[PDB]
Design a protein around this ligand. Structure first.
Ligand SMILES: OC[C@H]1O[C@H](O)[C@H](O)[C@@H](O)[C@@H]1O
Ligand SMILES: [Ca+2]
Length: 586
């Protein structure tokens, strides 16, 4: 383990994080929105699950055009969620339970309602004009409409620019129209960002930051037109010119130094960057401890499987190997380095992992939910569990498009309607995809009980901000799952206990090797820690599946699995449907 600097323990390496989506976690005042007092009331539940730390999605003052990721004030809690004092009380309560607290750092862009943007947009001559990207039209079209400065596509569909009537210029917004990109080329802007979004929260005791689209801060000079890679799309991906740009490491080093110099009590701060996509070299430049940039990053390959690289909302076939390789992208690069990795299958931007990677049928949703827990329990990195994942939550079914709340759905729908027609093959493919892939499958209220109609998220007379998934009626809820010894919730409790008990090789294990990589059903691997070997055999199918343990001997003991502990034959070399097993040899 000495030739593996990645094994050096840190609180944030071995902490299991639980991600809370504040709108949807727990309402305490029957207004249909989750809130801070709601979260506070459920910290014990989170601790009892086995979480060591929480990450709360944005709770700052926001118009909610992107459900909190459009921030109007970094230094004020959104009143619907509570007051600043409620937040400080929440941080303290989390701490007094022995848990760490990270907040969402959203500084690629702010709300157009932020005072910085209100000033910037007021004239062409004000001191904050160049805190954002303003450009004149590229002339006007045959209809008299201004033409945007370039052909870039918004992440949510359509053009990445919005015209401002007052100053007669476009501003850049890679996300929704009211999320103008901050200009990191402006040093005054960077310093103001650090003071408000970072320093304020360090001063109030956060243990770290989850850094929203942290790979987008550096724009290639000139904001050039992107090459035409999609011939059936008016607008083009800006990635070559916005993703992992030439100053991105400079910026992350600067912010890292700011954090180090701002902390007052010498505490260890974790940063997890939502970096989206990166080569292994880029990952190393971000996460090597000696680089003083990020602690770790999220990489999207594993959550991209089954989607077109050209458009997330066009489905394509995939096989198990594709997902194996994509998952391994999170962690293989750290082997024998001072880097660190993340492990997750769910967040507020993703559909449910049982639906995507297991089998969400009534017959198989429990066992396959447990299989996913066995897999995650054994992988190297900082583990994240997303609200409802521990309940074995599944995608909602048969929702009309008009029921979806997400701006990502609304904007993409409108762009397709405009470009291709509402009644088109393009729209049909889109509608097919949203049923599997929409971020909204993560965002329905947390299911605390079987109580009609709001499942204990809010009182029965309240109208939740977004519709409940019908699955609460099928026993996917906290109250019912606590009482069922066979539940996914109770299984996740066991999985976290297992992972912690064997943390040297589960959290810090190295020399990961696939066994039978090509297998369409068997997901198998080994890991090492000194004299120890972990061997995983995981059957991602309803068919029984054979496996072999490399260098098999008597020393391999069955330590964890999802079939009943008293009924598993550890010597057997065929997995039952959806069966997973972790063996450890010392
Ligand atoms: O802030 C724009 C986007 O950034 C990140 O990808 C967030 O996780 C996502 O929810 C948001 O829409
Ligand atoms: Ca509320």
């Amino acid at each position: 383990s000495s030739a593996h600097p990645e094994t050096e323990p840190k609180w944030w390496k071995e902490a299991t994080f639980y991600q809370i989506y504040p709108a949807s976690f727990k309402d305490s005042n029957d207004d249909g929105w989750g809130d801070m007092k709601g979260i506070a009331s459920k910290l014990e539940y989170i601790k009892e699950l086995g979480a060591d730390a929480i990450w709360i999605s944005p709770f700052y003052d926001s118009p909610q055009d992107d459900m909190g990721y459009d921030i109007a004030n970094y230094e004020k809690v959104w009143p619907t969620y509570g007051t600043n004092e409620d937040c400080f009380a929440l941080i303290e309560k989390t701490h007094k339970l022995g848990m760490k607290f990270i907040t969402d750092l959203v500084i690629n862009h702010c709300s157009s309602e932020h005072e910085w943007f209100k000033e910037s947009r007021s004239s062409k001559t004000n001191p904050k004009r160049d805190w954002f990207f303003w450009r004149p039209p590229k002339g006007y079209d045959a209809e008299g409409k201004p033409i945007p400065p370039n052909n870039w596509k918004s992440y949510f569909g359509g053009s990445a620019w919005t015209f401002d009537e007052k100053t007669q210029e476009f501003y850049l917004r890679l996300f929704c129209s009211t999320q103008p990109d901050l200009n990191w080329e402006n040093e005054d802007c960077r310093k103001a960002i650090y003071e408000s979004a970072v320093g304020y929260w360090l001063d109030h005791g956060v243990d770290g930051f989850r850094i929203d689209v942290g790979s987008l801060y550096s724009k290639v000079v000139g904001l050039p037109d992107a090459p035409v890679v999609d011939k059936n799309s008016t607008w083009q991906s800006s990635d070559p010119y916005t993703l992992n740009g030439p100053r991105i490491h400079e910026f992350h080093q600067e912010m890292n130094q700011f954090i180090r110099n701002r902390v007052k009590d010498g505490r260890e701060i974790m940063t997890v960057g939502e970096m989206q996509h990166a080569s292994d070299e880029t990952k190393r430049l971000y996460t090597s401890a000696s680089r003083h940039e990020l602690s770790e990053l999220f990489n999207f390959s594993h959550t991209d499987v089954g989607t077109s690289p050209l458009f997330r909302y066009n489905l394509v076939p995939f096989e198990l190997k594709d997902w194996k390789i994509a998952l391994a992208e999170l962690f293989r690069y750290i082997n024998g380095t001072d880097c660190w990795s993340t492990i997750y299958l769910e967040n507020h931007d993703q559909p449910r992992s049982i639906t995507r990677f297991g089998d969400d049928s009534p017959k198989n949703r429990v066992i396959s939910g447990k299989l996913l827990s066995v897999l995650l329990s054994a992988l190297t990195g900082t583990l994240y569990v997303y609200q409802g994942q521990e309940l074995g939550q599944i995608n909602f079914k048969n929702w009309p498009v008009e029921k979806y709340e997400d701006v990502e759905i609304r904007n993409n729908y409108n762009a397709i309607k405009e470009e291709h027609g509402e009644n088109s093959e393009e729209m049909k493919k889109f509608l097919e995809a949203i049923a599997l892939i929409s971020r909204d499958h993560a965002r329905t209220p947390m299911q605390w009980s079987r109580e009609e109609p709001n499942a204990g998220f809010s009182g029965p007379s309240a109208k939740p901000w977004f519709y409940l998934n019908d699955s609460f009626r099928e026993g996917i809820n906290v109250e019912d799952e606590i009482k069922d010894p066979n539940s996914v919730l109770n299984f996740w409790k066991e999985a976290l206990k297992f992972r912690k008990a064997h943390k040297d090789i589960t959290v810090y294990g190295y020399d990961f090797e696939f066994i039978d990589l090509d297998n369409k059903k068997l997901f198998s691997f080994t890991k090492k820690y000194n004299n120890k070997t972990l061997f995983a055999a995981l059957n991602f199918s309803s068919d029984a599946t054979d496996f072999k343990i490399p260098n098999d001997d008597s020393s391999f003991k069955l330590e964890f699995g999802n079939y009943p502990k008293k009924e598993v034959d550890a010597s057997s070399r065929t997995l039952k449907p959806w069966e997973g097993r972790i063996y450890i040899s010392e």
